[PDB]
Structure formats: structure tokens, C-alpha cells
Design a protein around this nucleic acid. Structure first.
Ligand SMILES: O=c1ccn([C@@H]2O[C@H](COP(=O)(O)OP(=O)(O)OP(=O)(O)O)[C@@H](O)[C@H]2O)c(=O)[nH]1
Ligand SMILES: [Mg+2]
Ligand SMILES: [Mg+2]
Lengths: 239, 142, 157, 315, 133
RNA sequence: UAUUAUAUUUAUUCAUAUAAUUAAUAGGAUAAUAUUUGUAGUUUUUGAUACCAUGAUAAGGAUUAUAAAUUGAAAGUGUUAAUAUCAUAAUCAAAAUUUAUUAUUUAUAUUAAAUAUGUAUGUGUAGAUAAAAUAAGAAAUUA
């Protein structure tokens, strides 16, 4: 008939019941879109870095610049480990990501002495390069914070160029299932009624929704559920 | 209201004996509708012109299964008497039937043939208090 | 329904909506109804062209048509119930328990005026008012002046 | 105070409060507002446009000499927005008989294009013979140099779609950049009809080629008629083309994609009658178009649905 | 333990679409996830519901003339219906038929937009009178 | 004690309520083209109800007086905001008097448009009651 999942309860098992429409900060109803199929750093979890992103440069631009170089466009290789880099992107130069913060604070001379090539002026085009396009992005943020006017990241960079599959960092799309209780750092007291209410941090987070969302192929999606259908634990009207 | 004789007993207030504008009292209760007049017989509580057609309610307007009672503004017609068919009207307690047909009814509305307030009173629809008050007015014997 | 998950505190507020539809039905049926009345009751000839047996015939034809119209709204306005859009309190119009320009009952007018919600102006409770016209002939006179500026100032064509 | 809230415009106890403007202050406008000027929205109605031609316009350019000379023959063929009911056999007989007498290439071909269009509206199948008899020799065969007049091509294509015909693929191919380069001059309705036909016939590969060209030529994607996109997509069963169609689906707009789903669910649904030929079952493509729609729409929060089974853990 | 208003109901939309569509989660209204609307009523129940709600004129009301009950009870008194064949003996039948209920297009503006003199208002738009379709 | 008057006038036959389903959005001529013509995913909840379910505005003269000035008051009279856990009761006409709380036409001429009151002539006649010092006209027995 009814039970803790179906009934109205302010609290279930000593913690705020996430099932109540009125236990959430109304801001959580505001409309949003799915990120996950977009480039890693455009996603919403990285929002603190969003002001910093870099204008892109596509594969076409890259081949064009291979055959037809510009004098004051610099292509800068950000690949960090020498163990993983076996080829040379034409007309590129090597500033590994790990050094960037230091490198960009050298004088023209000192920079010349440490990296063996001229430090790009702040007007010049700077194209950044990495395996996946992740380290190149982070490096980009560095170059942008010293204020460099044209900084382009080429995502998919060395992997697309050379057909290698390598990665700058090992990060995986899957989030580890949330462990503890709901964090008191996300609990949001209301200012008018002084009423405690959930936010979408923690075990409730949009990442988890997108992660477990229906697959985009009917066959793989039907494989995921029992014969009779997708949600049979629920009463018909909650399905 | 004090006693609820219908649903509205719950919703309505009496407001003591309150005055309404002329000929608008919220509830149309025609106590006078049967109020004998020989000389005014054809003009009183009937159509203002004798060239008016009979109302809607003397006619079968649509495809009907049948009715329980006909309306009380229906006018009694020679066929009401002659045809020997059920002629009912909604009065209180339940329904009044015209059983004993007469031509003297003809041409008047059944409003006028049905006494709204009967000289007859049920002692069993009355509280002991109400029965007392009906004995004071010299209606019920006691 | 059956008092399950009702949204409004008073159920009867819905009746107010029903009422609106009544007026709508009247707009749909007034012209028709009145034409059928006028053509039905006309004793003089209708016209030069329609007279005599044709006219009698046409009259009966029309009132037959009018009786056939199921659901045609013939109820006179003063017999429709006035009920508040707020608390669903009812009052008889033309009485001190109904307030006409806001169309709310006395009860709601009181509540709304005292906690400021309506903007009105208080005037001495015992007189005719600030208004010139009411000051002259009272309710009937002001009623008349309204007729005069709605209609009579026009010489129609 | 109550279950019914105050409405802030009519209540003087809101309007004249300290958080708003009192009636004794000077009542002028506070700040100006330019909304429509700063960032303006383009007009898109919820309803489709009522006057639009809704067909494939065949562009009749005739010299006003043969236009008068040929009038008793042309009066039987479609003029603008007018579709005479003359039986197609008769019209083709008239062309076969009288056309060799006319000397103009341009005239003979405008006339032919009218014949084709007329036969497209009646769905008479024996009209391709006309293509093989006159046009094929100087247009489609053995690398002939000559470049057909646009209206003729549009007409023949329109005929191959209206009468579902394998022939279209040969003509269409000649219209890409290296050939006649006619493809960027096609109407949105042209694309619509093409897609629908190809879909019925069931060529995933035709569908792919056509969607690629449409996209490159900058057709109006959102205004391609939804029914025809659905019937085309429905035709796709092959793994690679399927991949293509996901990636491609991202080219439509939010709204378009929502109604791709609605239309799809209707054509296999309630509105299965609406089609002359019933759809064929693609459960995969149906599911996918629904899924795509769901991905691209704004997301709503229904917490009792998401967290239905949530239990807290003390780990 | 369970008190319903209606015993059974039905789906607005049909097998081909639904069987596949179910693998995609749809967001229900957060505060009242289950929706049972008048499209979902059974045929019988819709008929009953549709009769009621029309004051006196409407077929639900026992005395409208459209009543299918053979008997009705006023204050413990049982009244048997007068059949129409019998009603007609004293109360003549003037019945035009359905054409009487529809005025021409010409009059639509006199009538504030309507052609139809029926008891419910009739809209010409798709949505107000929409059932499932 | 000075800053000033109740003992006048007119009234009192007082009645009116009924025929159950409150739950969502959707734009069209003179717009650069969407059939989005015809927008189709039943089913897990329970209070304002006929019913217990707090709030809030009435009426009700008794001593701040005359000048350039109001004879109507907060102590609360059905409908309004946190206690729920029997029930569809609501006017769209034409309808059934028991309810303290209501100024009706009284003798020349008397029912025409929504249908509109048939009853009580009795020596202005018991007991008991009502109203007024304000554009009217009243004058002498405070705590
Ligand atoms: O978007 C729409 C809406 C409606 N229709 C209508 O559907 C009817 C039958 O639907 P079909 O779409 O099966 O017919 P069809 O291909 O032969 O029609 P054309 O589009 O080629 O003319 C067609 O005859 C047309 O009137 C559409 O074709 N497209
Ligand atoms: Mg109180
Ligand atoms: Mg009701």
C-alpha cells in the first residue's frame, strides 16, 4: 500500500527525506541541460574555471598551419612526460605543463636560457597542444592568467594528429558511488521560515543523474533491465 | 438557518426579517399562486395576453425517455383531461397528481391548481417545540 | 473530487466559475432569443411583404424553432446568483449586502477595505458623498446621469 | 494572510509601502526600458505560415512568343497555383507530337518540365521514357558536356520522388559541386519530398548522402518537413549509417527535435493512418530519436522519482 | 483499506509508441506524480461523469427527460417515470431534429462566435474540448 | 454657587430559501517557408467536507461646550492563516411559514405585460412596550 518511500515524511532515517518536493532549495527546479557528452572542462562541475576557457583550434587549422606556417604564430607542445612522446608536432616547441607557472614569470632572457627558444610576446598567437587536450587546457589557463591575448587550445590534439591513444591524466567519467551522509556544507537553512532543506551537492548530484541515465541504444538499454520492464519497484504512477 | 430543510440550510443566513427590493426576494415561493378570483380568473397569475402561445413546457422538445413530473407552469389543456394519461407535478412532500380530470381546470397553469401551503399539517415533521408554537397560533388542536 | 487533494480552501469558489459560463451562454443566446420573442408576439403585420397567413405561419414556425433549442439561455439576470470571487459569500444585488463596482459581497468589501487592499476613500457615513450628482437627486439621479452619457448625448444615425 | 495571496497591483498596502512608490511622491517613470531594441527575437510562429506555396515551384520562364504560340497545349499543364485535371496520357501525346516542330532548346525544355510536373501530381509511371528519349542523350549519358536548365532537373527529381523511382540517385549525383552544382538552388520543399521518397524506398545510403549534402549546402534544416525526416530516419537499419544519424541529429534545433519525436510517435501510433504507405518498424531508431529529444530538452526535477530508493549510509 | 473513486482506467496512447517509450524516464509533476485525468476514464465512467454537471437541462438530472432510470425516490416516496409515448398524449411533440441546434455561419457574429445552441459551450479550437484526441 | 432646561411629542397586529462529481499548458491574413494541419507516456494517495479541525473588522448615548469644529465607541457580531482522519450535499429560475430582533396602503373614483398575495369592519379601545433635543420651532428639581 504505502510506505516510507511513498508517504510524506519530513525525515527518513534521521536525515532529511530527499523524496519530498518541498525539501529542496527551489533553485534546484530551475532548468538545466545535460553536459556529459561535451568536452571535459565545459561541464558544470568545473564551473569555477569557466571564466578562463580558451578559444578552440580545430584539426583543419592544425593541418593548414603544418603546411603554411605563420612567423609569429607559435605552436607550443604541453605534453608532460617524455616517456610518452615519440613524435614532433611540426614547428612546435616544448614547454611541459608542469613548468608553465614558473616559465611565464621569467624575463625574456631567462626564458631563453631555460627553454632554449624565444618567449612569445603577448600579442602573438599561441596554440597549445597535449595528448587529449586536457593538459593543454590547464596550461592555457596559465597563459591566459599572465595576460596573453591569443591563446588557443587544440583539443584532441596529439591523439588526433598522430592517431595515438594516450592521456594526460587518468581521470574517468564514472563517479564513485557517494559514501557517507549528506554533507552539512550543502544543507541551506531558509532565511524567512528558518527551515533546513537539501541542495544538489553530494549523494544527490546531477552527475549521478546523467551517469545512470538511459543509454542511447535500445538494445543496450533493454539489456539493463528485467524482461517485464525498466522500473517495477515503483507503484505504477511513479514509473 | 435554524433548521435545515434542504442543503441550503447550511449555507444561508436568515438575517432576521430583512427587506429586499420590490419583487426581488431571492427565493420564489409562490404562496399566492392558488388564490381564488371569479372576476380575475383569466388575468391572475396567468398570461398577460390571451394571444400568447403556451409556454415551452407544454411541448415535447427533444428525444425523451420520459419525465417524472411535468413543470408547474405547464398549462392544463383539454387533452390533459381527456387523454387519461399521468399528469404529475412536483409539490411537497412529494408529487401531486391530477387524477380526477375536469374541464374547469382548462386554460390555467398547474401553479394555480396546486395549493402550495396546505391547511393539513404533519405532526411528525414537527419538533415538540414547533408543535407547541403551532398550538399557540391556534392551528393544531391541544 | 470527493474531497481528495482539493486546491482551494473553499470548494464553492468553483461555482463562481460556473456563473461566468452562464453569462457567456447569455451572450451566445440573447440576440437569437429576443428576435424570436419579438417576431413571435407581433400582432400588427410584420411588414408590407410578409402579411396575413404567411405571417401567422411564420410566427408559429419561429416559436416552434425557439422551443426546440435545447440549452438556450433564457434566465433573466436578476435571478442569477451573485457570489464572491474571493470567499464565495453571496449577496442579493440591490441590497446593502452586495457591492456592485468591485462585485464582492459586503463581507469581503469590509475585510478588503479595512486591511488595505482595495483603494477607496472614506467619506462621512451619513450623507450622500463627495459626488455632485448623488448629492443632488440620490441614487436614482446618478443612475440617470449614467444613462445620459452612455446614450443620450449621441444623436444616432 | 490567507490561502489566497494579495495581488501587488491592486493593493495600496503593497503599492504605497516603503518598498514601492507612495502616492505623494512625484510619480514620474523610474528608469526607461529598452528590451525589444537591445536583443531582439526572430519571428517563429507556433503555427505554420498560411500563404506559403507548399510544393515544388517549377519556374516557368518562357519567351512571351512561344508562350502565346503554345497556349492551347500549355493551358492543359499546370500554371501558377492551378492544377488542371487533364489526363497525363494526352499531355504526353501532345508533347511527343508538337515539340519537334518548335525550335528552341530552352522552350522545349521548359515545356518538358511542365509535362513532368503534371505527371508527378497524377503519379503516372510511364513518364521517365520522356527522360530517356530526349534528355538522357545530352545530359546524363557518356559524359555529355551540356548542362540542363534548372527547372527541368527540379521537375524530373520531383517526379522521381512523387512516383518512387530508383532513377533519382543518378540525377541527384550529377548536381553536386563537380557536376552541375544545382544542389544549393533547391527549395526546402524539394529536400522534403526527396527525403520522404528515399525513406519509403528504404535506402540508408541515399538518406546519408542526401543529409550530408543538405547540411553542406546549408538547407533550412529546421523547416524541412518533420514527416519526411522521420520517414527517412526510420529507414536506417545499418550500423554505420546509424552512427552517422546520431551525430547528425545534433544539427537540428531544440524545438525541431521535440517535434521529430512527437511526429515519430504519432506515425507509428494513432496517426498511422495518415500515411499512404504504413511505416516500417524501427524500434531502434524510434527509441533513439526519443532519447535524443530527451537529452536536448531542458531537464526537470522530480525528486520522488530519482531518489525513490535512496537509503543513507554511515560508511 | 483502499478507497478509490473509479475502479479501472485506461491509457491515452497506444502500444507501438508506449512499449518502447517506457525506457525513457519522463518527469512527472513533482508534487503529484500520478495523474489520472478525464482522458483516462473508462467509457462507462466518462458517460456518467459527462451526464452530471449540467444543472437541470443535462441528461444526468432525473427529470430532464433523458433519464434511463425507471424509478426515482422523493422523500421515501417512489415515483414511476411517465414514458414519452404517454407524455405525448397530452403534451404535443414538436421536434425539429438536430438541424435546429445549429445556426448558419452567417449568424456567428450575432451569437458571439458560435454556431451551436447546445447546453455546453462548444469551442472551435482543438484543445478545450480535447479528450485524448 | 458661578461655565444655564428630561416631563414634551409621536408611536406598537411583522410572515417568507432549492433537484450532488472543485486537478494542465498549447500562439493562425498584409511576418523570408516547422502539417508543431490533428502537440495523445492511465493507475501511491488521504482535512475546510453534510464533520472535530485556534487567530481577524459588528452592535451597544451618560459629563474635554462653542469657536475658524462631527451626536457613534476596541474589548468583537456566520463565512479569514499551522489540532484534520464518517459521508460529492450550493442557486443557472418559477419551490415547503415557528422564526426574539419587523414602522403596511384605514372609505369620492381600486388587477394592462416577468406571476406577484382572500383577508382581522367592530367606542384609536388590555397588560406591556418603541423613538427623538442635529433646519428647525419643547425651557427649569446635578454628581
Ligand atoms: O506533413 C504532411 C501532412 C499531411 N500530408 C498529407 O498526407 C496525405 C497522405 O500521406 P502520405 O505522406 O503517405 O502521402 P504522399 O507521400 O503520397 O503525399 P505527398 O506528400 O507526396 O503529397 C498526403 O496526400 C498529403 O495530403 C503530407 O503529405 N505531409
Ligand atoms: Mg469571532
Ligand atoms: Mg456543483
Amino acid at each position: 500500500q504505502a510506505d516510507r518511500r511513498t508517504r510524506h515524511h519530513m525525515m527518513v532515517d534521521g536525515q532529511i527525506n530527499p523524496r519530498e518536493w518541498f525539501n529542496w532549495h527551489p533553485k534546484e527546479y530551475q532548468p538545466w541541460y545535460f553536459d556529459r557528452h561535451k568536452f571535459l572542462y565545459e561541464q558544470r562541475q568545473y564551473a569555477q574555471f569557466h571564466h578562463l576557457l580558451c578559444h578552440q583550434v580545430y584539426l583543419k587549422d592544425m593541418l593548414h598551419l603544418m603546411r603554411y606556417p605563420e612567423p609569429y604564430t607559435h605552436i607550443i607542445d604541453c605534453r608532460t612526460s617524455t616517456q610518452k612522446m615519440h613524435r614532433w608536432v611540426p614547428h612546435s616547441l616544448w614547454l611541459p605543463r608542469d613548468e608553465v607557472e614558473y616559465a611565464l614569470q621569467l624575463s625574456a632572457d631567462e626564458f631563453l636560457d631555460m627553454y632554449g627558444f624565444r618567449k612569445p610576446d603577448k600579442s602573438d598567437d599561441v596554440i597549445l597542444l597535449s595528448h587529449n587536450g586536457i593538459y593543454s587546457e590547464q596550461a592555457g589557463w596559465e597563459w591566459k592568467k599572465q595576460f596573453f591575448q591569443h591563446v588557443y587550445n587544440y583539443r584532441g590534439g596529439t591523439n588526433e594528429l598522430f592517431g595515438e591513444s594516450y592521456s594526460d591524466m587518468n581521470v574517468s567519467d564514472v563517479l564513485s558511488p557517494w559514501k557517507g551522509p549528506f554533507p552539512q556544507s550543502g544543507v541551506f537553512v531558509d532565511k524567512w521560515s528558518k527551515r533546513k532543506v537539501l541542495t544538489r551537492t553530494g549523494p544527490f548530484d546531477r552527475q549521478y543523474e546523467m551517469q545512470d541515465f538511459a543509454l542511447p541504444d535500445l538494445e543496450l538499454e533493454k539489456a539493463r533491465h528485467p524482461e517485464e520492464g525498466p522500473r517495477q519497484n515503483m507503484p505504477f504512477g511513479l514509473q | 438557518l435554524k433548521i435545515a430543510k434542504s442543503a441550503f440550510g447550511f449555507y444561508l443566513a436568515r438575517r432576521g426579517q430583512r427587506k429586499y427590493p420590490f419583487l426581488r426576494r431571492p427565493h420564489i415561493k409562490n404562496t399566492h399562486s392558488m388564490n381564488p378570483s371569479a372576476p380575475y380568473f383569466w388575468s391572475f397569475m396567468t398570461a398577460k395576453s390571451q394571444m400568447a402561445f403556451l409556454p415551452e413546457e407544454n411541448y415535447i422538445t427533444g428525444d425523451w425517455t420520459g419525465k417524472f413530473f411535468v413543470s408547474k407552469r405547464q398549462v392544463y389543456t383539454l387533452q390533459h383531461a381527456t387523454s387519461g394519461a399521468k399528469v404529475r407535478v412536483k409539490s411537497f412532500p412529494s408529487i401531486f397528481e391530477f387524477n380526477s380530470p375536469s374541464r374547469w381546470n382548462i386554460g390555467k397553469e398547474m401553479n394555480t391548481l396546486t395549493k402550495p401551503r396546505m391547511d393539513l399539517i404533519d405532526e411528525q415533521m414537527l419538533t415538540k417545540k414547533q408543535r407547541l408554537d403551532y398550538v399557540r397560533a391556534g392551528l393544531l388542536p391541544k | 473530487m470527493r474531497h481528495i487533494g482539493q486546491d482551494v480552501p473553499k470548494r464553492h469558489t468553483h461555482f463562481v466559475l460556473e456563473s461566468r459560463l452562464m453569462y457567456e451562454k447569455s451572450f451566445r443566446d440573447c440576440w437569437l432569443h429576443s428576435v424570436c420573442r419579438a417576431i413571435s408576439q407581433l400582432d400588427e403585420p410584420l411588414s408590407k411583404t410578409v402579411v396575413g397567413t404567411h405571417q401567422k405561419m411564420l410566427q408559429r414556425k419561429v416559436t416552434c424553432f425557439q422551443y426546440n433549442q435545447y440549452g438556450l439561455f433564457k434566465t433573466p439576470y436578476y435571478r442569477l446568483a451573485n457570489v464572491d470571487r474571493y470567499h464565495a459569500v453571496q449577496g442579493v444585488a440591490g441590497t446593502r449586502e452586495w457591492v456592485p463596482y468591485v462585485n464582492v459581497s459586503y463581507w469581503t468589501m469590509n475585510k478588503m477595505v479595512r486591511g488595505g487592499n482595495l483603494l477607496v476613500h472614506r467619506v462621512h457615513y451619513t450623507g450622500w458623498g463627495t459626488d455632485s450628482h448623488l448629492k443632488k437627486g440620490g441614487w436614482e439621479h446618478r443612475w440617470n446621469k449614467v444613462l445620459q452619457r452612455n446614450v443620450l448625448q449621441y444623436s444616432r444615425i | 494572510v490567507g490561502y489566497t495571496p494579495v495581488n501587488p497591483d491592486t493593493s495600496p498596502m503593497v503599492a504605497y509601502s516603503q518598498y514601492h512608490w507612495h502616492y505623494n511622491l512625484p510619480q514620474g517613470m523610474e528608469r526607461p526600458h529598452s528590451v525589444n531594441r537591445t536583443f531582439a527575437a526572430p519571428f517563429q510562429s507556433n503555427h505554420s505560415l498560411v500563404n506559403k506555396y507548399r510544393g515544388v515551384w517549377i519556374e516557368f520562364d518562357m519567351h512571351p512568343a512561344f508562350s502565346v504560340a503554345l497556349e492551347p497545349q500549355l493551358r492543359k499543364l499546370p500554371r501558377g497555383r492551378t492544377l488542371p485535371k487533364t489526363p497525363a496520357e494526352e499531355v504526353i501525346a501532345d508533347y511527343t507530337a508538337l515539340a519537334p516542330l518548335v525550335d528552341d532548346e530552352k522552350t522545349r525544355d521548359l515545356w518538358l518540365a511542365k509535362v513532368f510536373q503534371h505527371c508527378a501530381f497524377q503519379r503516372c509511371g510511364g513518364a521517365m521514357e520522356l527522360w530517356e528519349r530526349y534528355c538522357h542523350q545530352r545530359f546524363t549519358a557518356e559524359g555529355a558536356t551540356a548542362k540542363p536548365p534548372l527547372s527541368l532537373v527540379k521537375s524530373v527529381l520531383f517526379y522521381c520522388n512523387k512516383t518512387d523511382n530508383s532513377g533519382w540517385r543518378a540525377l541527384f549525383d550529377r548536381c553536386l559541386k563537380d557536376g552541375w552544382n544545382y544542389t544549393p538552388l533547391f527549395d526546402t520543399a524539394q529536400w522534403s519530398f526527396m527525403l520522404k521518397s528515399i525513406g519509403r524506398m528504404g535506402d540508408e545510403d541515399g538518406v546519408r548522402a542526401v543529409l550530408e549534402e543538405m547540411l553542406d549546402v546549408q538547407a533550412d534544416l529546421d523547416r524541412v518537413e518533420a514527416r519526411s525526416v522521420v520517414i527517412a530516419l526510420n529507414a536506417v537499419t545499418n550500423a554505420d549509417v546509424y552512427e552517422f544519424v546520431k551525430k547528425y541529429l545534433f544539427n537540428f534545433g531544440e524545438r525541431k527535435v521535440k517535434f521529430l519525436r512527437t511526429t515519430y510517435s504519432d506515425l507509428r501510433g494513432h496517426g498511422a493512418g495518415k500515411l499512404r504507405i504504413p511505416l516500417k518498424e524501427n524500434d531502434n531508431m524510434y527509441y533513439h530519436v526519443c532519447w535524443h529529444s530527451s537529452i536536448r530538452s531542458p531537464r526537470q526535477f522530480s525528486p520522488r522519482q530519482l531518489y525513490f530508493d535512496y537509503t543513507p549510509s554511515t560508511l | 483499506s483502499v478507497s478509490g473513486v473509479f475502479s479501472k482506467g485506461r491509457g491515452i496512447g497506444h502500444e507501438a509508441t508506449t512499449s518502447i517509450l517506457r525506457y525513457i524516464p519522463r518527469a512527472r509533476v513533482p508534487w503529484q506524480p500520478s495523474r489520472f485525468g478525464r482522458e483516462n476514464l473508462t467509457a462507462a465512467d466518462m458517460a456518467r461523469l459527462w451526464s452530471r454537471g449540467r444543472y437541470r437541462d443535462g441528461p444526468g438530472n432525473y427529470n430532464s427527460g433523458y433519464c434511463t432510470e425507471r424509478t426515482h425516490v422523493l422523500e421515501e416516496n417512489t415515483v414511476s417515470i411517465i414514458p414519452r409515448r404517454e407524455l405525448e398524449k397530452y403534451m404535443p411533440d414538436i421536434t425539429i431534429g438536430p438541424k435546429a441546434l445549429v445556426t448558419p455561419v452567417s449568424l456567428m457574429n450575432a451569437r458571439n462566435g458560435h454556431r451551436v445552441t447546445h447546453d455546453l459551450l462548444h469551442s472551435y479550437d482543438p484543445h478545450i474540448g480535447r479528450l485524448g484526441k
